[PDB]
Amino acid sequence: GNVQTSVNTYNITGDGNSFTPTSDMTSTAAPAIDLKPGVLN
Amino acid sequence: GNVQTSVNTYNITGDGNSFTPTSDMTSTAAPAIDLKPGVLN
Amino acid sequence: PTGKLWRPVGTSVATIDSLAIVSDRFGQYSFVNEGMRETFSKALFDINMWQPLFQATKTGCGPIVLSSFTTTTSGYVGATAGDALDNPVTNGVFISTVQIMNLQRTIAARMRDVALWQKHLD
Amino acid sequence: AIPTMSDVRSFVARLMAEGDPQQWFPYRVDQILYWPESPFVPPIGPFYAPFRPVNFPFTTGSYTVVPDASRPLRLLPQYRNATITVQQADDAYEDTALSPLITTHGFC
Amino acid sequence: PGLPIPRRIVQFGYDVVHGSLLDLSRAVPTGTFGLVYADLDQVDMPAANRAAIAMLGTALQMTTAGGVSVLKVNFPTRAFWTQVFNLYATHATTLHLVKPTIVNSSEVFLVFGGRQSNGALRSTTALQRALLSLYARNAAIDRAVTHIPFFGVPDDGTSDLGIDAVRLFDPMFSDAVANLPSNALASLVSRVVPSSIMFTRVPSNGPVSTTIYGKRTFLSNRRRARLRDVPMLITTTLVHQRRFTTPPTFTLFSSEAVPVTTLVAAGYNSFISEQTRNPNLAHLLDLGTGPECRILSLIPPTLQVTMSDSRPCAELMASFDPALTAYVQGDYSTAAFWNGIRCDSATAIFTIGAAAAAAGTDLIAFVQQLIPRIVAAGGTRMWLQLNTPLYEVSSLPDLIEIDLRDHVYRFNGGERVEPYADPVPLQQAIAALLPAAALSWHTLSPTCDWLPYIIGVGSPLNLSDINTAISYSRLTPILHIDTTTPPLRVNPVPTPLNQQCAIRITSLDPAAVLSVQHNGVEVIGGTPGNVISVAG
Amino acid sequence: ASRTDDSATSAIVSRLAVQHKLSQVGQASPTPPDYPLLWRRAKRAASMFVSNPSLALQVGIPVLTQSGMLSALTSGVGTALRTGSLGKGVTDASEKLRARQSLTVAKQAFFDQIGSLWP
Ligand SMILES: *C(=O)CCCCCCCCCCCCC
Numbered sequence A, B: 001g002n003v004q005t006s007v008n009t010y011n012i013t014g015d016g017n018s019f020t021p022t023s024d025m026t027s028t029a030a031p032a033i034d035l036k037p038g039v040l041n
Numbered sequence C: 001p002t003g004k005l006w007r008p009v010g011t012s013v014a015t016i017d018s019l020a021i022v023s024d025r026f027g028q029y030s031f032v033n034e035g036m037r038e039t040f041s042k043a044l045f046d047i048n049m050w051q052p053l054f055q056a057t058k059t060g061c062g063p064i065v066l067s068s069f070t071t072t073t074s075g076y077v078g079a080t081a082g083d084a085l086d087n088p089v090t091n092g093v094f095i096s097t098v099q100i101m102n103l104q105r106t107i108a109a110r111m112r113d114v115a116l117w118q119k120h121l122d
Numbered sequence D: 001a002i003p004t005m006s007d008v009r010s011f012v013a014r015l016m017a018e019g020d021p022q023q024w025f026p027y028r029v030d031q032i033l034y035w036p037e038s039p040f041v042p043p044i045g046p047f048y049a050p051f052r053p054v055n056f057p058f059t060t061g062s063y064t065v066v067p068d069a070s071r072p073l074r075l076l077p078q079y080r081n082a083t084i085t086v087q088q089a090d091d092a093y094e095d096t097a098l099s100p101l102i103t104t105h106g107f108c
Numbered sequence E: 001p002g003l004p005i006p007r008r009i010v011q012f013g014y015d016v017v018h019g020s021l022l023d024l025s026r027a028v029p030t031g032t033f034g035l036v037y038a039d040l041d042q043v044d045m046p047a048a049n050r051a052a053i054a055m056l057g058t059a060l061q062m063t064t065a066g067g068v069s070v071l072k073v074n075f076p077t078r079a080f081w082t083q084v085f086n087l088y089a090t091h092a093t094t095l096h097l098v099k100p101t102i103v104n105s106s107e108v109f110l111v112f113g114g115r116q117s118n119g120a121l122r123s124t125t126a127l128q129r130a131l132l133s134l135y136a137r138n139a140a141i142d143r144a145v146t147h148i149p150f151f152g153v154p155d156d157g158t159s160d161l162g163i164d165a166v167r168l169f170d171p172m173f174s175d176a177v178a179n180l181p182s183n184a185l186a187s188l189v190s191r192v193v194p195s196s197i198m199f200t201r202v203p204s205n206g207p208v209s210t211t212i213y214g215k216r217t218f219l220s221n222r223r224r225a226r227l228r229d230v231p232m233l234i235t236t237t238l239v240h241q242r243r244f245t246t247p248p249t250f251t252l253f254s255s256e257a258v259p260v261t262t263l264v265a266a267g268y269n270s271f272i273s274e275q276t277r278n279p280n281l282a283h284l285l286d287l288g289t290g291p292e293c294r295i296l297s298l299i300p301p302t303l304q305v306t307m308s309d310s311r312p313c314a315e316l317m318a319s320f321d322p323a324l325t326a327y328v329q330g331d332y333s334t335a336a337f338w339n340g341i342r343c344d345s346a347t348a349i350f351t352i353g354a355a356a357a358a359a360g361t362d363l364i365a366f367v368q369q370l371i372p373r374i375v376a377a378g379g380t381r382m383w384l385q386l387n388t389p390l391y392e393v394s395s396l397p398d399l400i401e402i403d404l405r406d407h408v409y410r411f412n413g414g415e416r417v418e419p420y421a422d423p424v425p426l427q428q429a430i431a432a433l434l435p436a437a438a439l440s441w442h443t444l445s446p447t448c449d450w451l452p453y454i455i456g457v458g459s460p461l462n463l464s465d466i467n468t469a470i471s472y473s474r475l476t477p478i479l480h481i482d483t484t485t486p487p488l489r490v491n492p493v494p495t496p497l498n499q500q501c502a503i504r505i506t507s508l509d510p511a512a513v514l515s516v517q518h519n520g521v522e523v524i525g526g527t528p529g530n531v532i533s534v535a536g
Numbered sequence F: 001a002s003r004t005d006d007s008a009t010s011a012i013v014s015r016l017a018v019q020h021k022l023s024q025v026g027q028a029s030p031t032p033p034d035y036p037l038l039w040r041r042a043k044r045a046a047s048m049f050v051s052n053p054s055l056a057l058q059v060g061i062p063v064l065t066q067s068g069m070l071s072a073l074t075s076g077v078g079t080a081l082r083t084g085s086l087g088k089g090v091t092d093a094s095e096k097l098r099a100r101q102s103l104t105v106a107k108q109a110f111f112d113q114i115g116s117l118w119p
């Protein structure tokens, strides 16, 4: 967790972070991208 | 089936309605709306 | 384009660093690409359909236009300052976070409403 | 029943107040379009066309007049379905609320 | 009545207008009297004590030998209570404090028995209790009045009891449309739910204004906070009106003193408020809340509660966050209802009595099946507004009749009839149900500390009725159970006044402080070694 | 699989009616069709099908084996799927919800230890 500083806009051990799940926003990237023949073109 | 009048453009017991399925237009609404992560964005 | 919209925090000259997710009192405006409007329209379309039953039963609150949750901001819209720099969009249609919340809980609240009637009709 | 200047003026005032000019029935110079689905039954001649707007919101029926309440009547609150968002349901109040409202104390 | 007609009355004071003007501080040039009723004011504390100690000194001087001096102290300080019991430790025989609370002040009246030279008026534990009860109430009466705005100050949002309205001009309240006129109606009612909400329509020779005020109290701030959204109101009733009423008033208080029954009810809305305010309480349910959850105001906006009632809930349950507030329909009297409803604490206030009557069953037998359900429902705490005559089998003439042929009440003789239990039988029946649980009866305490619920919501009252309600509260206590702790052990059981009894609190640590308090005033406090007791 | 007289058990009920109704035509018609009993009979018929699809082949199975049903059922279930809406999940979305809160309350309990043990 050693301080970095600019590489990325947020420090991990940074001031006032906060792990806190909300039933409201179910974390998700993009897995189901459609590529099948008919659907991709 | 009591007469209504304006609430909706059609009366049910209205004049000359007609139940009549056509193999041509299989009734539906919109069930398969895609929302999966990759596909909704 | 796609992703949240960014704007030159350093002003005028927009480089791969003078950008920053344009956040604010409403959350962050995320761009609403053409196809993603197809869904929210297709979802709202299936609800508007039940208009005659919403008035009859005094629930609902008028037809839900998707143009009530969006906005017409403009800036660069990408996934990161670097790549957002190559998507200058003018007067695009973005939906702010707090809005992405209502269009959500509205389509959800209304969805219950209809899901019920829609079951009797069936 | 007997319009009085105070009253006529309170109507001519309500008329002037910015609003939306009714649009269901367009205006003509020689014909008064009357809703077919309406109590009014046209006289005879060529002055009344039975025009029907696409969606008139009014239904028929009357209203029996009720005398003026002698004191502010309390109203139990029964809710509807749609709900306003705290943010919007706030300024909405703050745009028409009586804020620095002078009030009597009476005796507790 | 009771007092004989005195021969002659000799007036004095600073503005007598019929007798000479004397200054009770110093000496008086007059003769004695059987009764020397002194009512002068003391008013900035030490010389004020001297003023009083002096006044009583001459008033307890003007009395005929074997008379009755009735001085009135303004600040019975434990600074004056040494000087008085020292100087006049002899002067009279008896002595009673007669604090007539008309308004909130600490001025007490003292009457001296027989103005005989060799008396012995020693300060007793009575005084400590009397004096202590007095103050215990000024904290209650003061804390209560804090909720009220200072006279002649324009209403802001700051004042707790402030009356907030919304004047619309020719408002088009429409259903299914969020048009401003109908949008303002929302907030307003949301900002003043448990209150009144009075709507008026005065016709100006211009448009027709329609204010819609309501007494925004702290009972709404608690409720409104729990709201996640501001629901709409069926504007039909408003759209129907179409008649001009009188102009709005905007008055913090209504004109008449609330019913003895409300003085009692608003005596629990303060009690449940203080109980539910407890952290560890977690998830709570209400067996038979009103048709419209009235308990949502008496709970910290964070606690997860689930009100239930046979009738449908009056407030759109949707506007509240599902996780925090739940609503179950149907009665709890029926076995079915209890499937899948687990709350660590239940509260059956205002219902438990009506259920026994509705289910046409015996009161003891009823709770005999309810308590065990709450245990299974997974409940650590319980609060039930049971109606049993624990203090006395004596009843109120107009408020509650106690039919003895059949264990039953008659609130307003007829208006509603609900069976009751007895202090002892019902006591042992519940102790047999939950053997390890500790029971305790909380009842409207004379300190009137609940006040920020009557004077807090803007309702008048009669300082004389507090007595009625503290007697109506005794007819229907709130049996507070607590399975989470060991119960007491009283060796006499139907404990008789003036008999030594054995009480045993089973706490593992000797390093604890015992502090038994009755009436909202502590009376016995102190680690084993030393125990200050004003109750005996 | 719930008392919701669904589109499936509904397609069948309409057959039982139209069927039991003409079998009553001609003769004293002393028995006006039931319906509360028909709805319930067709509910177990559609239910017995979902249960053990096979049965509909065996001679002697109540309702299910009359020529109407199935040919009927499917074409119902058919249009039934082509309209579900999106919020079909509203079914028992109450206990389902109450069960999810049940889990988050237990998972919050977990985070509470992660929060203490490793301060
Ligand atoms: C320094 O690296 C100390 C370790 C703290 C973080 C290491 C990885 C564990 C936490 C993950 C944070 C990023 C997403 C899990």
Ligand SMILES: *C(=O)CCCCCCCCCCCCC
Pocket (backbone or CB within 6 Å): B001, B002, B012, C121
């Ligand atoms: C009046 O309501 C008499 C009953 C006639 C229609 C009731 C419902 C049955 C027909 C449904 C029509 C709408 C879609 C099925």
